[PDB]
């Protein structure tokens, strides 16, 4: 009979914003946010440009979709589950699709759907090679605003002992 | 914004559309959000799936109106229509028809 | 009086190559190489597209150079030091420049200049925020061939306890 | 390849040039390597530094021959020459000279 789970390790999501001088250089400012690695994915550092994905962008239509440059970090904000009665894919599947399409890592704002978190710590479907992080509250909010207002940002998911 | 949406969030735009319209994922920098359109934008064609209708980008070199993913209806000025596709010069095997621009 | 230094931690440099189906997906194959983190930089994971830099590409000319997309991983192959009597920059400086120009990390093949390694484990100039890795032998060679023949690859420098 | 090099590696191309020529960093995918040129390629101008000569890219909207980083000598067909730069329409403060195309 199992017991209280080991608590899930913190994913330190550093978000870099950057400006480009005319000559060629780059000043950057950084922004430390926090979430959790889940059983659904790996527990390893990862890094790449951020790209929002609408949660219906990720379906197995077989319908030819845009080639995004390999190595992007997906950011997906989930909707209340009663808005979506019947998903094309489980939250697991959406992760799996993003990777197929070149995502080096994926991050869910679950703040509006808490079930997801346990749906991702099930781990009965196969767990991915790349990290799958979940975030909420002020951190998730902070992240969505960047996506919304900044023209480009880079995400560095970090793992520490 | 947020026109045609059945439901509509701040962060994802439209999520589902009204019955007759078309779902279109506008990419705009890091963002991507829903729009629910009357007809699909230039460069796109629509697909009326059982579940939902939605836009897809063309991807046929030298097309001007896609119908489906693999069929063009109006090629570019200066171009030959063949098995759906568009050709500067009409590929080997067959050649242009007199008075017509097809092959 | 100091003693024999603590040996330097291994940087596990995973190199991903990727093919793009027409529909949108990506199959990838991976290639594990090894080098060392140095005192000159951090000892943290990092990830980004690879970009060779000629060792004279990195000088403080002040002369406006190309904007490379932020987050690239530099790969530099150093030349025998008697070919270059008088450097524009120390190997330290070259690292520092690459970062200025958006490099998230930097990797030196030193196999043809072993002095570099001790020049990088000096650490008397200021050490960088981003990792600085050094490689040689069959690993360095393996890496240069990829750069040379493949059209694009992604590097994932990894750190483990 | 490997023409004009004083020294020349397999992996970096030319490293130093012969005395009179120009160093040019050809980017070609992930690669970047030295070439030692007689004159700089189209889209580039040269700078005869004390140490070494080398090419730099133009970066002047609507230029056709850079001389220096901030000076154009031949603007594009259809364009006005002003303080070095090229203009579709000549910016506010001063206006085109009769018989000339300058401002």
Residue numbers in the entry:
A (entry chain A), C (entry chain A): 22 to 182
B (entry chain B), D (entry chain B): 39 to 141
Give the exact sentences the study uses for this entry.
Rspo (R-spondin, also roof plate-specific spondin) proteins are evolutionarily conserved from fish to humans and have well-documented roles in a broad range of developmental and physiological processes resulting from enhancement of canonical and non-canonical Wnt signalling. ZNRF3/RNF43 specifically targets these Wnt receptors for ubiquitination and turnover, hence reducing Wnt signalling responses.
The first, extensive, area of interaction involves hydrophobic interactions interspersed with hydrophilic (complementarily charged) patches contributed by the first two β-hairpins of the Rspo Fu1 and the region immediately carboxy-terminal to the β3 strand of ZNRF3ecto. Overall, the ZNRF3ecto dimer structure appears less flexible in the complex structures compared with the unliganded structures. For all ZNRF3ecto–Rspo2Fu1–Fu2 complex structures we determined (from five different combinations of species and crystal forms), the dimer found in most of the unliganded ZNRF3ecto crystal structures reoccurs. The 2:2 complex resembles a crab with the ZNRF3ecto dimer forming the body from which the two Rspo2Fu1–Fu2 ligands diverge, without interacting with each other, as the pincers.
